[model samples]
Target: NPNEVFCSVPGRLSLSKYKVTVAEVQRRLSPPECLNASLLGGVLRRSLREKLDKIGLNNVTLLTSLVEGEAVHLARDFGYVCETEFPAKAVAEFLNRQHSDPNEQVTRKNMLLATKQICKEFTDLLAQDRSPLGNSRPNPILEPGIQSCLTHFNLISHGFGSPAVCAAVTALQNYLTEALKAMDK
Candidate 1:
């Protein structure tokens, strides 16, 4: 499943021509190895680490911030592109239908609630600074909840394909955008 590397399923004509490069970059940056710990993209570390330190947080949590921030940012771009280039509503509708269980028909309200739960968890963590997280540690890493969100995005892309995944990404980005604004209040 070469397309799996792109984090999306294949066989959807609408999404076939979709550029997976951003998502490919996202996939590589997703879990485990987020920052450039090696020689390949090592140059990124200097700048990224500076940003992390400027913000005053540990490496792992800050790395999650970088990854999620990039993911949502790229997802917004990809989502808009997919929304314009493909029948994104159809793909979203398809996902909405498929995810609905037989016993309990899932509504958009339910989806929004679930989305809110994820978004809240993400925002709550995003709101944290050096205070709740304590002092900077030697070896930084991802929190379990943060990692779960990454996995959630991965699953969305792999299971539903890019169009649908982009739709989900857009929703996430929208929530976070507003959430961040409200956090300032």
Candidate 2:
């Protein structure tokens, strides 16, 4: 998937556009190549590195920090997004009519439980973050036909209501920094 790329996905639409760019820039800097495909506009590295080098750290370490940090940050975002959608989809997919066979009836429950399990795993990882992206409340009903998805679900899944951009970017930077520090040490 050409996910997290600015042109492929609109900048305002993405929860972590700036952070993703920063991470991409940082990643490109590390590689021993002439051109970096990650930049918003493709940048020729030998020339670009010389400019970036003026800032402070060597090209390698700076880039390493960006890559490692972004990887964790993006993974967290992906899992959260996936888990967010699972609940409603599960309930709908699992529903059975009164006249349905017993075997089909069991499918609904199993799908709901499976989706719930995915959310649980995602929640566990999110809890461990030094700074979490956002605090989300799960639906009380786990209802099969709620028509309206909750604010939290909409934000996480489709980013429908509040942008939650601040929290998501904060999580990306914080997670990336901490992860890189551990690796460097």
Candidate 3:
């Protein structure tokens, strides 16, 4: 009877397998790579770009300016995330180490020091102007990616499946894409 169950459904999914998948997904939630830093910047850019496109603007000074505003707004909070959230998540990842180990066995101390440097580097990356354009004299906008990371932080802070985050990100992305124009040039 158990063997006949397979024959009854041509393309049925394995519920048992899916149950195991959630376990992996839980584990996958840790790790440094799981932490996305550029989350806020992209969302802000996407939202701003949509508004500008609707007004039919050529120069993106407005777009760039809004980003600058966001930059100042987040100057301090961003660090809290990097220094607090980032390093902690990095530790979480270390403890959740994957199945394979070819000698690069990471200890908690190693993870902590590594995280400290990474957070410093990440914060510095956002603080300094490295962009080739150097759009403003003092530079503008939080690194778009850094902005993105903040918004992503909000996502988890608000709730695991935060509708607000989903609404904002998707709406911004949709707004960013104005159906593409070409012919009139």
lDDT of 2 by residue, 88-147 (tens): 333332333332565654564555456556655554443332321122224344344332
Best of the candidates, lDDT: 1
Each prediction's Cα lDDT score? Answer: 0.39, 0.35, 0.31
lDDT of 2 at 131: 20
Give the TM-score (vs. native) of candidate 1. Answer: 0.26
Clashes of each: 2, 1, 12
Tell me how far the alpha carbon of residue 117 in candidate 1 is from the true structure, in angstroms, after superposition. 2.7
- Candidate 1 overall Cα lDDT vs. reference? 0.39
Which of the two, 1 or 2, has more TM-score? 2
Ordered list by TM-score, greatest first: 2, 1, 3
What are the models' TM-scores? Answer: 0.26, 0.30, 0.23
lDDT by residue (106-127, candidate 3, tens digit) is 4533554565555555545444
Model 2 alpha-carbon drift over 4 Å, by segment: 1-27, 31-47, 57-99, 102-107, 126-185
